[PDB]
Amino acid sequence: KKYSIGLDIGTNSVGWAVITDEYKVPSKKFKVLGNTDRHSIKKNLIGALLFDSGETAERTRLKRTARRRYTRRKNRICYLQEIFSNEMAKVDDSFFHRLEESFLVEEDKKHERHPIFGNIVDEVAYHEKYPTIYHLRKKLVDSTDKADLRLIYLALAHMIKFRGHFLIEGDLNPDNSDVDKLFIQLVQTYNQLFEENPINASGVDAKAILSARLSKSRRLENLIAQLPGEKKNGLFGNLIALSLGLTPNFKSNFDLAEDAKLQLSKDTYDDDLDNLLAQIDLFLAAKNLSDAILLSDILRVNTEITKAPLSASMIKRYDEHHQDLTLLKALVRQQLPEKYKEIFFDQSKNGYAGYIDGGASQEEFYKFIKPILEKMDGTEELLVKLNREDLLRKQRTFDNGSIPHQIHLGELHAILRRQEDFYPFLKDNREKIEKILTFRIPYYVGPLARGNSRFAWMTRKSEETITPWNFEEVVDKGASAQSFIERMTNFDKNLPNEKVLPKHSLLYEYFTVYNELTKVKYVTEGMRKPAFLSGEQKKAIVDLLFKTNRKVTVKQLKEDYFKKINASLGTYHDLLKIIKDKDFLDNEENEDILEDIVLTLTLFEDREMIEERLKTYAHLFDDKVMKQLKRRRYTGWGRLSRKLINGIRDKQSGKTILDFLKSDGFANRNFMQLIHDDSLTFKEDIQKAQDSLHEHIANLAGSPAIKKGILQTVKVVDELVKVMGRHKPENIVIEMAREKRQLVETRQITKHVAQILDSRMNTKYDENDKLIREVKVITLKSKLVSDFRKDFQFYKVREINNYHHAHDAYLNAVVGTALIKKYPKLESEFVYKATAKYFFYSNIMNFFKTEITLANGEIRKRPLIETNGETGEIVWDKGRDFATVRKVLSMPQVNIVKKTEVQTGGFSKESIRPKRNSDKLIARKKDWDPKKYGGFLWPTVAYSVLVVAKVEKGKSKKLKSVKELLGITIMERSSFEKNPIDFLEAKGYKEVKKDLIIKLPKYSLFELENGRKRMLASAKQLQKGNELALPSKYVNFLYLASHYEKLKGSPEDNEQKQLFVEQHKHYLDEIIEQISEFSKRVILADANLDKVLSAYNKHRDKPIREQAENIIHLFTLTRLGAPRAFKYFDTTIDPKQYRSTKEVLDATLIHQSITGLYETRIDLSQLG
RNA sequence: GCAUAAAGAUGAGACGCGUUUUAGAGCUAGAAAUAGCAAGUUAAAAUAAGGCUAGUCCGUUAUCAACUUGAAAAAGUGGCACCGAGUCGGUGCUU
DNA sequence: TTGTACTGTAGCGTCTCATCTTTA
DNA sequence: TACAGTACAA
């Protein structure tokens, strides 16, 4: 009467089985609903549920940030146009409207088709004058003429729209660092500080380290070669620590005024050089070198002194492109005149035309043109330009990601500074335009929402619209920066209402050192029995050692104190070398505000909000010591709150928990032992400190991929309980996969299972016990059932069918129950040192084996009947039990369910196809007709919809009644579910029968003649749906065959398996018969099938291993799901696609429940 | 609990490309189908259609068999034993 | 004039910062 | 892998 549910959870499957206490799987007649004639169907209680993998929220987040970036960039351009509008209205007022209209075709425009100047002659004169935008930018930076206001807008908008990265946070200016040589300036500044003035000889110094990975192995030698040496690490002769600090902190080499540990930084050189900058320079020339190295790396050499180096570099790129284009054209004319048409005219060959007008990248163009350029002569400098990747370049390439925003800011500042005198409004709000360019939302502020986002945490002081100008007096940056951290650091697991402390808390580190000092016991001459460290001894250990040094050694008790009378307190040592007062550290009277200091230096990292938090302590401290504290910075958070640390007194000892850790006398108790005890009043308070599955699924943290596996397992268990007449099982057996995103997600998809199933299943209790254990949830490791498979010839072959999930589940259930009934006293080990446990798990399994062999090559015998022994009940019966297992594995009917899903995601594929006279193109925008503008293709159908209505076909318009499938794409889903009838009537259908509309998601199952099933992949595509239930003998033979010598068993055993697979060669022809019969009944791919037969016939002489391996490959023909392309020995067999859904409109639609036991068949041929 | 690993999540702020349509007067010999030649590097705009609480916000993760109640949330709906096994069949009790 | 049947398409490279988490 | 685009076949 009782039973047990076995489960095998995966990332793409949930295998379920129901066994009774003698390992048989029962079967029941289930009621069939619907309008078909069949009223009851026999089904076995074993099966699997398949689904598509659950996806992480990553891609959605990336596209969301891209959306926000485009919105904010368009807002930047709108701010700049708002600035320009009043004066633009006085000169060519339609200008911004033409720029907005630019995308439209010639007929859709409402102004002249030429955007910039609004007529042909001025537009072509402009494009002849400035071939690129960079010519215009350099002209506006350098020339001193009053320019047309439109050109000013074009340049400023081009800098503001595409504006470079923000990684370099210093206020870099390139014009002081344009030159590649700085050696003489650095050496002059050196010897006016270090009065030597030795004989010196100049040399270029920036590029010389750019030749290699920047390191001293070049530099010490080259700098001694530059300046005649009196030192080696402090010559100030282009030493690398001036260019970039060392990544490990190291003290100053030939220091200027004070000892300080230099570091690689772009955040602290404006502060940590207070050896001078708070008391007053080599470091000026040093930072000039520091700019110079990457600036020469990212700008080409400038021999003319211009204020716009980036525009000049791009002009140089353009000019060399033009020269090499002319040269290459002439050369391929005069040497290879038949290749000229292919290179410069055919735009699909990766030539020059395919590099400009086609879609070939620079690398593809180089790879194509290298043989052409090399087989010629006179093309040598072009070849070296190609080897340096500098041949026929473009002004906007993939490697413009190195330009910092400072260079664009310099060019924009130069343009405004030149042109302010002729247009006064440009001078009146130059700062505003520079702010538009330079502004970023801080990462700790997040989206600028008004309470309508689920991603925002910002709090605003006022309620005005946030522009880049009033951002500092509308956003409470302090509170927002706080909430950026507070939303992330979780509460403690015990009292989930208080935020945890920082890990560098004095209280938390006190807790840690006292916790792992509490259970330190010393055995010595002074006592005959071991005693733990008393509170005085723990005090002495902390006070002498921890409060002076971070490392620990307990031996001071034996060597000093008894005559005299993974632990650290790092923050105490830090604050003792900063404040340098031991009193104010040991003074607990202000320890709360000391923790406030630690908390603020943990919450905040941007410097002035740290100072903002230390305004309130200005009266405690003098100015230089907050200059010392602001440089300190703490990272990481403690695991438990302050209420558990200091907000509680025990009702028996009278002590706070940290007082026990400080002093619990002898018989010391640690933190965990304290809170696990109920005689001390902690456990009941923790239980008092403590309601839906769908949140319990989430706050048990992990990716949203866990939710599918766990939740489908839970719903399977719920419906399986419902199937058995609400009678709860006595066991549930869980695969755990303990001893690869699939495996780590799988282990997360198994860890939660025992908790959720035990909490859901066992819910009734009494006054004597607060849970009556009724459903023992067993946890098993995969090794157990894997050894059970490989030890009694129950081999799995994953390629044949999806029955292996259900079979694995059944195996989990049988070995789990048969394990705990043999060893009842070991419930507390499975039911909800490493080598010893490994040997335990290795030697537990042998009780199944009739013959047991030790690690001695000798024999012992075990009886056929296994018994518990504590009570004589039989728990395994060698014989009928193996017969039962083989019978269950050989069953042909297993409930395999593909979970039907309404598809969600992108509207279509992301590439934008060119224009065509086609109706399949999806409009990019409401007014943008794709016949003129192009659009997207491959839309994704959300779910199909069976309709039955009249359509007006024939040039004689009259109503033929029709019934056909229709694909409701993700774009149309909302407009369809709003009102299906009007949407269908807009699709042309007329007199739609509203009650006959059937929503069909993906993998909707239909049954056809001969029991041939098809899964609806879309309105225009089907999938295979049946399972080849190949008998157990053939799968055993195939596993023993395809792994022919990699089996690695003991010698005589693998040899007799060798002769067995040799002796049963006819199984190959029998499996060919099985696949041919199944594929002629259900797969209906004749050409692929007789290709398979012919390829099998032509390789009958091949060895058993290779033949069997290709037979394993052969099951891709009959597999459930999409038709795939497989290969035999030689031939690659392309799939027969099921590319028409006319076939299922007269079939039996099957509505399977999650277990698949409850069905609702709808015969579609009786509709319309 | 801490130290020593690794693998993975969730969120925010930025950058550079790419694609698309338009603008950058193509010339000559010609009924031309055309053929020769010249040119090519850049810009604007969009970058899920869109939505309304109109924010420098939100729009691709998760959830979803059918049927009966329920706006929704949700709740509810399907007899058993035995002999067999080509995707489940048969026989026998029961209302 | 419209159903099969075959080869072909399919947005991606980072960077700065936060916190977590499970399994050894 | 599910559409799409050419190119047979009615």
Numbering used by the authors: 3 to 282, 288 to 572, 588 to 712, 718 to 766, 918 to 1010, 1031 to 1366
Give the exact sentences the study uses for this entry.
Based on our kinetic data, we prepared cryo-EM samples 1 min after mixing SpRY:gRNA with NAC PAM DNA. By 13 bp of R-loop formation, REC2 and REC3 are well-resolved and stabilized by R-loop contacts. Furthermore, the 2 bp and 13 bp intermediates provide additional evidence for this model, yet had not been previously observed.
